[PDB]
Amino acid sequence: TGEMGILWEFDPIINKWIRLSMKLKVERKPFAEGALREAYHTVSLGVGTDENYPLGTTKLFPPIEMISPISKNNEAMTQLKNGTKFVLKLYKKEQQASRELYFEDVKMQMVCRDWGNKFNQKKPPKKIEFLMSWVVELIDRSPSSNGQPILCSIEPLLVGEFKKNNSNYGAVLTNRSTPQAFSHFTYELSNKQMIVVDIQGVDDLYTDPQIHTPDGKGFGLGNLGKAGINKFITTHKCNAVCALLDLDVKL
Ligand SMILES: Nc1ncnc2c1ncn2[C@@H]1O[C@H](COP(=O)(O)OP(=O)(O)O)[C@@H](O)[C@H]1O
Ligand SMILES: [Mg+2]
Ligand SMILES: [Mg+2]
Ligand SMILES: [Zn+2]
């Protein structure tokens, strides 16, 4: 039959969240799992507005000043339109997850999308793209728990061979140039204030990346700070794409 959700889209250029609704139908069992999450095949039963589901309240997160009152322009209306097959992700059985973490995870994926666009403006041999991600509140479910409402993230379905190219702790898992050159690009151009790793997906369409920052603050559970940054440095070998972008040989 399906279930309702409040759907949240972040737009970095206006620095605001857009609040929508959708109906979806999720398979009972996951098709894949990672270190932290389980992934479920899902179908869209349509995207709509949030008009029927008022915010009310204060404790509100995101805070009201961070939400656009207008939602007419969005990615969800196209990318999650009625009939679309996509992916829903839940944290495995959890304790360290707050409401804020889900939004932080989605914002992080959006920040990576901006880095992808920045990398592409340099005219690399292979352009890259990160998938959209959204927060969904599964408002038809009881809170179970703990009493906490049920949240998840959703993303488009990748079709093809899913491959991890690097991890968030120094592993270089494939021999391809582009994913490693991009990680290096983000480190140099950010004045070493961040790096994008966990570059994974189908060809150069990536998802669930991870950012480290020197102070380790923000960017979710997987931000391993200076330690994560140094691990990347220890195993990074510059390649033909690094050289084309004129990246520093010393990190
Ligand atoms: N958008 C997607 N489309 C298809 N399969 C996916 C997608 N995202 C993740 N997967 C699969 O689900 C697994 C778990 O996803 P996730 O926890 O996000 O990544 P990780 O592999 O870093 O743990 C992945 O290893 C991959 O096999
Ligand atoms: Mg991540
Ligand atoms: Mg953190
Ligand atoms: Zn390099």
Annotation keywords:
Phosphorylase Kinase, domain 1, 251 residues, Myosin heavy chain kinase A, 6-stranded antiparallel β-barrel, alpha+beta, binds magnesium ion, binds adenosine-5'-diphosphate, Protein kinase-like fold, binds zinc ion, 5 helices
Could you walk me through the main structural features you see in this protein, from its secondary elements to its overall organization?
It contains five helices and 13 strands. It has a six-stranded antiparallel beta barrel. Strands 6-12-11-9 form a four-stranded mixed sheet. The chain has a two-stranded antiparallel sheet with strand order 10-13. It has 251 residues and is an alpha+beta fold. Helices cover 22% and strands 27% of the residues. Strand 11 and strand 12 form a beta hairpin. It has two domains: 159 residues, Phosphorylase Kinase, domain 1; 92 residues, MHCK/EF2 kinase (Protein kinase-like fold, Alpha-Beta Barrel). The chain binds adenosine-5'-diphosphate, magnesium ion (2 copies) and zinc ion (ZN). The site of zinc ion has 6 residues, from helix 3.
